[PDB]
Design a protein around this ligand. Structure first.
Ligand code: SF4
Ligand code: SF4
Ligand code: SF4
Lengths: 76, 50, 60, 50
């Protein structure tokens, strides 16, 4: 399975990167390229993402962007 | 003193500021979601109680 | 089910967001299997957008 | 009173909290970066000034 983040909907809140086990640090924060709005964005680094589907099943992500797929995507 | 209580009763899930953005409050006690749109601290129901 | 002009516009915008999203994932794929899987989802969204382009112009 | 001036002098870009997460302060006046890690208001050098 895969867990991607829609970078148009995401607002750089933190409520995701918050799940990700520190040791793995899969969710990131590309920051500041002239932004008030959203602040930053937080894409999942595939090169290192244990895929515990923490992020996605924790519910909290206002905009709804933590995708969650494997053979067909569904968020909410 | 009671206008925050009407905000709890109507806007626990969506206020009209949230609904223009498509936002959806995901729980009753979250602190914020900001710095987006200037900042959002204090929209949850727990905060309206305070 | 005749999808209303608003539903056609909504679906065309959603398909473009996904397309946009999916394309980006190609850059981030860490292996060939993940890249192929993304590529399949991108191609499915290209076909959906192509099938929605004429209805979308009419709906607009 | 002057400990925040030392923090301005040393940690305008990275402090030990930041460096541990790999973060970097992108401007001198941002208010926060949101709710992650518990909350991050007030780390910038303009805030340390206040
Ligand atoms: S799926 Fe697991 S490893 Fe991947 S970003 Fe989410 S919490 Fe981290
Ligand atoms: S919870 Fe949603 S909006 Fe917030 S950083 Fe994660 S993906 Fe982005
Ligand atoms: S300073 Fe404001 S936007 Fe930042 S975490 Fe605190 S309440 Fe949220």
């Amino acid at each position: 399975q895969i867990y991607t983040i829609i970078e148009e909907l995401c607002i750089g809140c933190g409520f995701c990167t918050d799940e990700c086990p520190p040791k793995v640090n899969a969710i990131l924060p590309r920051d500041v390229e002239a932004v008030l709005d959203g602040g930053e964005t937080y894409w999942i680094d595939q090169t290192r993402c244990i895929s515990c589907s923490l992020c996605f099943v924790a519910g909290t992500c206002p905009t709804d962007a933590v995708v969650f797929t494997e053979g067909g995507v569904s968020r909410t | 003193g009671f206008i925050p209580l009407l905000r709890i009763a109507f806007h626990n899930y969506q206020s009209p500021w949230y609904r223009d953005f498509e936002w959806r409050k995901q729980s009753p006690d979250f602190p914020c979601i900001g710095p987006v749109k200037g900042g959002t601290c204090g929209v949850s129901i727990q905060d309206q109680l305070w | 089910m005749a999808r209303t002009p608003e539903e056609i516009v909504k679906r065309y915008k959603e398909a473009n967001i996904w397309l946009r999203h999916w394309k980006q994932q190609i850059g981030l794929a860490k292996d060939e299997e993940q890249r192929e899987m993304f590529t399949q989802y991108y191609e499915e969204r290209v076909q959906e957008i192509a099938a929605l382009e004429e209805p979308y112009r009419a709906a607009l």
